[PDB]
Structure formats: C-alpha cells, structure tokens
C-alpha cells in the first residue's frame, strides 16, 4: 500500500489528466492517491521536500534534483467576451503584437516563475511590452472576469472547455505561442510508480490519437 501524492495545476483538470489517474488507479488498485493544487514552482519545492512524488505542470524549471519530462505542447488561445471587437479574428487568429494595448488578465498569483511570468517571457521574446496587465488568483476567475467584461486573457487550448459562458477563444498565430504540459519528478526517485504513470499518460494519449512517444 503506497499513497502516491500528485501535484497539479488546476487547468489540467479539464484535460486528460483525470482519465490518466483513473486509468492508473484501475491498473494499480493497491496504490492510493491524493491530488493537491500547486504552481509549477511550488512543485519543485514540494518534490524536493518529498511533499509530492509527481508534479504535473506548465513550466520547465531547470534544477539538479528535478527530472522534467515534456508530455505535450499545447497551443495558446486568447479568451475574449463574445461581443469584444476581436470577434472578427475568431476565424483567422491574432498575433500578440496586435493586442499589446488591450486590458489583459494574467494568472495565477503565486511564487515566480508562474504561468504569468511564462506569458510575460513570451512578450519579451516577441519584442512586445503590454501596457495594461492585471494579475488574478486562478484560471476560472480570470475567465469569469473576461465574461464579466474586464479584459482579455491568454489561456491554453484546453481552457476552451471550462464552462464559463459567453466566451470566444481566438487562435494565437505566433510561432512561440505554446504552453508545454510536463511531468516533474525527483531525479533520484527510481520508484516504479514513475514509469507506470508515464505508461498511463501514453495509453490515454494514444487512445486520443495524440501519440508521439514521450522522451
């Protein structure tokens, strides 16, 4: 009997992660499981300290003690209210240099590096300096607020299915406009539950026909 403790960023609950856990549970019934919400940075510390054994996240934080496997690179979308003047680019899509002056929401509020600093790093890379930014606690608030008419917000593709009403998700046409889904584990951790969970990720992935091999 092993209690495997898994860290996750919230937006992954709307993708394939729950299936992967479900699959893992059915295949490994003796291994009990706990899920904890925490940012990618906090997972490094959680992992290092042994608070969690696996970390599913959105950022590659390089570190001696941490082995980091990129699972899938997911396109980014700009979330808007359905009446916002960027409607017209629903089909074609937008470059980030076209919305530098738009009131924008970043998320989450957390110890850096965040998904917030990930986006700001994308702006820097693309020579862009956003004039109107606001930080919001977590993703569902951000989207709620976009629906409430408080600006636009860059999110990953799988945020589309979240359930907040009256939104549109404009494609982002930039080359670097992708958010990597990754699994962080302890470099020294040689437990069998690591390759097992990786087997599940691949099994689910293959069923959904998104199957380049990981690693």
């Amino acid at each position: 009997s092993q209690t495997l403790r898994i860290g996750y960023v919230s937006s992954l609950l709307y993708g394939l992660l729950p299936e992967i856990i479900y699959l893992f549970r059915q295949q490994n019934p003796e291994i009990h499981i706990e899920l904890i919400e925490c940012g990618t940075k906090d997972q490094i510390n959680a992992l290092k300290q042994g608070k969690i054994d696996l970390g599913f996240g959105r950022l590659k934080i390089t570190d001696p003690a941490i082995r980091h496997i990129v699972l899938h690179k997911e396109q980014l979308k700009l979330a808007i209210h359905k009446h916002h003047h960027l409607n017209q680019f629903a089909a074609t899509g937008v470059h980030l240099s076209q919305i530098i002056d738009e009131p924008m929401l970043l998320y989450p509020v957390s110890q850096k590096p965040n998904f917030a600093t990930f986006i700001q790093s994308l702006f820097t890379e693309l020579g862009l300096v956003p004039s109107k930014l606001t930080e919001i606690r977590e993703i569902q608030l951000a989207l709620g607020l976009v629906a409430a008419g408080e600006g636009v917000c860059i999110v990953p593709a799988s945020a589309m299915d979240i359930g907040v009403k009256n939104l549109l998700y404009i494609p982002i046409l930039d080359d670097d406009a992708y958010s990597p889904i990754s699994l962080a584990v302890r470099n020294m951790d040689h437990s069998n539950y690591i390759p097992k969970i990786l087997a599940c990720v691949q099994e689910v992935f293959a069923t959904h026909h998104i199957r380049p091999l990981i690693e």
Copy 2:
C-alpha cells in the same frame, strides 16, 4: 462609486458574469471589484463594508444581513460515466440510496459552508453517510470524481464545468436544492441593490425564455 461584490467560485460557471456584464453596461459610471469569498466570510465582509453585495449558496441568518433568495437550484450527483449509478441517469436517485457511496464534500473553508449544507440534508432525513471526504474546492471535487475516487453532490450549473467523462444523476428528494441568495447589509438602501436585482431579472428572464 466603487461597488465591491463577493461571490463563490461555482457561480462563475452560471449566469452571474452575464449579470455583472449587464450591470456594467447599463451603469458605466460604476466601477466594480469582484472578490472570491465564502458565504460565511461574506457576512463579516458586509458588516465591515468590505463588500457591498454577497452572492452565495447558503442562508446564514444574522441581524445585520438580509438574504434575498434569487433561485432555488436542483442538486445533481456527479459520478464517473462507468459508475454503477449510471443506471439512474433517466430516473434519478434518492439521498437515502447513496449514503454508503464514497462521497466528496466541498469546499474546505470556515463553516457553515456547502459541505455542512450537504451534510445537513442527510441529517434532516435521518441519514448518516458512512464515507465523507472534504475537498478544497469544486474543480478538484469533480476532477477526483472523474479520477474515480467517489461521487459528489453538486448544483445543476456544475454540469457545464467541463471535467471530462462525467454524468450528473438527478437527486429526487424534495429538500435536494441549493438556494442562490444575494446577501446585503440589512438596512442598506443604496440604489445599486434594486439595480443589481433588475440585472438578475433581465438575465434570468432572457434565459427562462431564450434561446431557441
């Protein structure tokens, strides 16, 4: 004016944002701040003037606070799509029949909260659940359900929270509803109160009627 509004996270998946968006269009001169805040914590925030309106799912009585029930919303049992209760997707189930199901409550917050509300529904019917687990908040509860860790009673609007591979079984008991109430300072007669209720109506009536 700077109007400050308290809300619970699940409401963001329903009509509330439309209500805010509408109010914001009709009253452009009024600035708005939205703050996450449990229904219990709303009582104290109102008293302090920390917030002006509270949007919650419980009717916590208090001399200082007026509860305006906006909508009584049906509760549903969230289950994994292969869970043995999927037989009852059409017919629905009773709370007396799920007392022994591994159950997830939420959130983890100062009580009374939605967790104590759900617990009181069983207590009210003389039922005592054999396996309960408190979970931080709704998204995780449903994620866990899809992960195969149990069942979770949730309001109807939770159906649209797009956690994959779930079914939402009707709950047949008469008491099995969650009231969505507006909490305000008792004697507060600001004109944003009637205005916000007007916006609630307009959004409600648009959806009670439309779309085709």
